[PDB]
Amino acid sequence: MKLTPGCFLWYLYMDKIYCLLSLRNVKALMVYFHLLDVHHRNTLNDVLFFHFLQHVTNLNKSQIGMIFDLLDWTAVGEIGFDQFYVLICILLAHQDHLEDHFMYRHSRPVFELLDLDGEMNIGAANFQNYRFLFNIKKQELRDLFHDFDITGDRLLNYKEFKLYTIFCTDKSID
Amino acid sequence: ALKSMTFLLMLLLIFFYIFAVTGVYFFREYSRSTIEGLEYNMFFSDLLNSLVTVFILFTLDHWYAVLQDIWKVPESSRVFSSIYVILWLLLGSIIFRNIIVAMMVTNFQNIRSELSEEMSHLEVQYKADMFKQQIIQRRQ
Numbered sequence: 001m002k003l004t005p006g007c008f009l010w011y012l013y014m015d016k017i018y019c020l021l022s023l024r025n026v027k028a029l030m031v032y033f034h035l036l037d038v039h040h041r042n043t044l045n046d047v048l049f050f051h052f053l054q055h056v057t058n059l060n061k062s063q064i065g066m067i068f069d070l071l072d073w074t075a076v077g078e079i080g081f082d083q084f085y086v087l088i089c090i091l092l093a094h095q096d097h098l099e100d101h102f103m104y105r106h107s108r109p110v111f112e113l114l115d116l117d118g119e120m121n122i123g124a125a126n127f128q129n130y131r132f133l134f135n136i137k138k139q140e141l142r143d144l145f146h147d148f149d150i151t152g153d154r155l156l157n158y159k160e161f162k163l164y165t166i167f168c169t170d171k172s173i174d
Numbered sequence: 175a176l177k178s179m180t181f182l183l184m185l186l187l188i189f190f191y192i193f194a195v196t197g198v199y200f201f202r203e204y205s206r207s208t209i210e211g212l213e214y215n216m217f218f219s220d221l222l223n224s225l226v227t228v229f230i231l232f233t234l235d236h237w238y239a240v241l242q243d244i245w246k247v248p249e250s251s252r253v254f255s256s257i258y259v260i261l262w263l264l265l266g267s268i269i270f271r272n273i274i275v276a277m278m279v280t281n282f283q284n285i286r287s288e289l290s291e292e293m294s295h296l297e298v299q300y301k302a303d304m305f306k307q308q309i310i311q312r313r314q
Contacts, residue, residue: 151295 003030014089017105029088033081043078057091063132070116070129094134103134104168111158122156175281182277186270193262194228195221200255204247214243231263232270 002008007026015021036052037044044052046068053064071083079087090113092099106113114130115122124145131141148156148164198221205219217227217240231237241256 153292153295157299 003027013108018102026085029085030081032088033084036084037081042081044081044084045078049079049084057094066129066132100134101169101172104165104172106165110165111161114156114161120158122161124154175278178277178281182273189266189270190225190228190232193266194225197228197259197262198224200258201244201247204244207247209246212243212246214240218244228262231259232266234263234267237263 003026011021011026032052033044034040036048038048046065049068050061050064053059053067054061059067067087068079071087072079074080090103090107092102094100094103111120112118114126116126116129117123127141127145130136131138144164145154148160150160198218201218205215205217209215216223217230218224227240231240241260244256244259
């Protein structure tokens with residue numbers, strides 16, 4: 001197969017949701033994951049993940065640890081190859097201007113990445129983690145949170161988050 | 175609550191300040207008199223003593239006995255001094271105690287109000303979730 005039907009469908013979805021599908025991006029990500037995973041046990045250690053992040057994106061140690069903790073939902077002390085590929089696709093050369101619009105588009109659910117708790121509500125800690133992952137001003141983040149919190153309970157619903165993302169995408173396109 | 179204590183506390187302390195510094199030189203002839211037999215003389219002597227005694231009047235303990243011990247001053251028809259201290263103690267005590275208890279129960283009121291609106295929003299979200307569950311089920 002062409003590196004499993006699940007990853008083939010993921011690549012098809014990425015090509016349908018992005019203007020450019022690149023050339024062997026998934027293959028390069030798999031090669032980097034195999035290079036990072038020394039034991040080839042379909043898992044990578046936190047030290048290896050931090051070393052790869054510092055070598056590629058030159059991120060801070062605390063930011064790399066926070067990203068690894070957010071990605072490892074199993075909390076087993078290791079990061080899987082699928083999780084590493086998902087993180088690489090979420091980054092997608094974040095220094096580019098179009099990468100901000102790509103991150104605003106996010107993924108098919110486009111809610112669970114922000115909602116680390118998983119209770120269909122994103123808190124101030126999740127907002128701070130998102131602002132650490134993607135560069136945004138503190139005042140702008142506070143204004144966006146105030147605009148999103150219509151009820152004033154400081155909770156972000158899935159429908160409200162989808163509407164806010166749609167409005168942001170429409171404003172960016174226009 | 176103590177975050178909500180913003181202006182009422184400085185209003186209280188500035189009323190304490192103005193009334194104490196007014197009452198310093200009102201019963202001046204109480205402490206500054208040649209009467210041998212007296213025991214509350216030191217109450218109205220110093221500025222710090224004035225602060226302590228007007229705080230005592232604020233707490234309203236033995237105001238009767240304080241007034242009788244100041245009655246050993248020659249009674250100048252009580253036209254200005256006794257009515258001043260009585261008005262000060264009564265007004266300050268009742269106004270400040272009442273204003274603090276009112277604002278504290280107001281704090282409890284808005285605490286319960288925000289709690290109740292949180293549960294109301296949660297119930298509305300639950301109703302919307304159940305309705306969207308029906309919508310999804312019919313959509314399969």
